[PDB]
Amino acid sequence: ANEGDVYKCELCGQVVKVLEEGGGTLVCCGEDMVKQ
Amino acid sequence: ANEGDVYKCELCGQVVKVLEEGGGTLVCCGEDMVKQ
Ligand SMILES: [Fe+3]
Numbered sequence: 883a884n885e886g887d888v889y890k891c892e893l894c895g896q897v898v899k900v901l902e903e904g905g906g907t908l909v910c911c912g913e914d915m916v917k918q
Numbered sequence: 919a920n921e922g923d924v925y926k927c928e929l930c931g932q933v934v935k936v937l938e939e940g941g942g943t944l945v946c947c948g949e950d951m952v953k954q
């Protein structure tokens with residue numbers, strides 16, 4: 883994802899902010915995190 | 919992970935910071951992101 887984006891896990895509610903972009907998909911609780 | 923924690927994907931270099939904690943394990947590029 884891109885620097886500054888915020889991603890949320892819909893199942894457990896964990897929210898992270900991207901500090902350094904990478905192209906990998908962020909996954910949490912067996913599912914792709916959702917860009918906010 | 920817990921609020922304020924920083925995690926890195928060693929494969930693609932993506933770095934995230936936890937804003938709201940959740941009990942799920944952060945995964946990127948198919949493996950567990952490493953706490954810094
Ligand atoms: Fe990755």
Ligand SMILES: [Fe+3]
Pocket residue numbers: 891892893894895896910911940941942943
């Ligand atoms: Fe989760």
